[PDB]
Structure 1
Amino acid sequence: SPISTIQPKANFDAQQFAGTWLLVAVGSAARAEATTLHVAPQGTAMAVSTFRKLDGICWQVRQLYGDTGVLGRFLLQARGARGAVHVVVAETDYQSFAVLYLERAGQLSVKLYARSLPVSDSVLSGFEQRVQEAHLTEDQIFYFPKYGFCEAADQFHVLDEV
């Protein structure tokens, strides 16, 4: 459980974390992009919508980040075939960036989100420093497009995992 060694944002505040986040980069060993997150607090848990533009069409996936009893630590419960996904919001100033850790089947990934572009060089370097500390190489870092985002899908392109 590599993600259990990660400290969540102290006194994580869902209210300040709410809103829109843009995916900047992902560090993962896991073997059409431009992603956007819409976060809305639901008491203790967080309702999370993910939007991705594929071949011009915007798709939306509605999920629920369940409260795990530790502020800043969430759980995307397993969905039969889909293994459970542990989520941790580590570093974040709520106003410009967020570094999140995800774990599935014991495999840790690190994601960098921003409120708007461009992201500061300091945050980018910080993220890179966190990626190597998670035992991931520079070649396991994937930077997403700064163009191609979308944040609205019609009823025919919405997947509800809630």
Structure 2
Amino acid sequence: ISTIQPKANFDAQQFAGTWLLVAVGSACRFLQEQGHRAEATTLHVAPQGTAMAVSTFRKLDGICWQVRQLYGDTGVLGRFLLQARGAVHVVVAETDYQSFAVLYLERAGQLSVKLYARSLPVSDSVLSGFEQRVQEAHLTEDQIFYFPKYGFCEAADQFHVLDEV
């Protein structure tokens, strides 16, 4: 279990809308092997209470899916609990709300760092900043995984939506 700082006055309303997944910093089983298999991933965030409704749209087996999660209130502005074995702790670490965002997630005591953007090209200084941040998050330059830059799902399709909510 590990703890660092959320966005000062983190503002769910400013952070709302669509984000594009650019890179994951992690070491899970999956991301080393089936690495070459990352699908283009789009996050849709909307405020709901001190929680946050989060839709993720992506292909399974070449159909667009939509996963509906709930980034529930930790009681700390900026931290979010999510939940299969594990407990997901989300941290909004860094973000202008207009271009990029850096998220952390802890599960079964283990960190992962996510980088999102409103559009590509992302900036390189932003890529650097996130690289710099992972190499102090204690994961290696080989443990960064850059996701696709095209292939993003439009809308999921009523039959094909996961409703973890």
* Cα contact 1:83–1:104 (8 A) shared by 2: yes
Please say which of residues 151-160 and 89-98 is displaced more in the overlay.
151-160
Task: Kindly state the Cα deviation for residue 32 of structure 1 after the two structures are TM-superposed.
Answer: 5.0
Please say which of residues 130-139 and 48-57 is displaced more in the overlay.
48-57
* Cα contact 2:38–2:147 (8 A) shared by 1: no
1:111 counterpart = 2:125: no
Secondary structure in 2 matching 1:71: coil
* Cα contact 1:32–1:53 (8 A) shared by 2: no
Change over 3 Å in CA distance of 1:123–1:51 after alignment to 2: same
Q: What do the CA deviations read for 1:38-84 (whole angstroms, capped 9, x no partner)?
A: 0000021000000112343101100000011111100003xxx3422
Secondary structure in 1 matching 2:129: helix
1:34 counterpart = 2:32: no
Q: Separation in 2 of the partners of 1:51 and 1:27?
A: 20
Q: Separation in 1 of the partners of 2:157 and 2:140?
A: 38
TM-score normalized by the length of structure 1: 0.92
Secondary structure in 2 matching 1:46: strand
* Cα contact 1:60–1:153 (8 A) shared by 2: yes
Q: What do the CA deviations read for 1:73-98 (whole angstroms, capped 9, x no partner)?
A: 00003xxx342210000010000000
Q: Separation in 1 of the partners of 2:17 and 2:154?
A: 12
Please say which of residues 52-61 and 125-134 is displaced more in the overlay.
52-61
Task: Kindly state the Cα deviation for residue 104 of structure 1 after the two structures are TM-superposed.
Answer: 0.5
Q: Separation in 1 of the partners of 2:85 and 2:13?
A: 29
Question: Equivalent pairs: percent with the same residue?
Answer: 100
Secondary structure in 2 matching 1:50: strand
* Cα contact 1:101–1:108 (8 A) shared by 2: yes
Please say which of residues 148-157 and 42-51 is displaced more in the overlay.
148-157
* Cα contact 1:32–1:54 (8 A) shared by 2: no
Task: Kindly state the Cα deviation for residue 152 of structure 1 after the two structures are TM-superposed.
Answer: 1.1
Task: Kindly state the Cα deviation for residue 155 of structure 1 after the two structures are TM-superposed.
Answer: 1.7
Q: Separation in 1 of the partners of 2:115 and 2:137?
A: 14
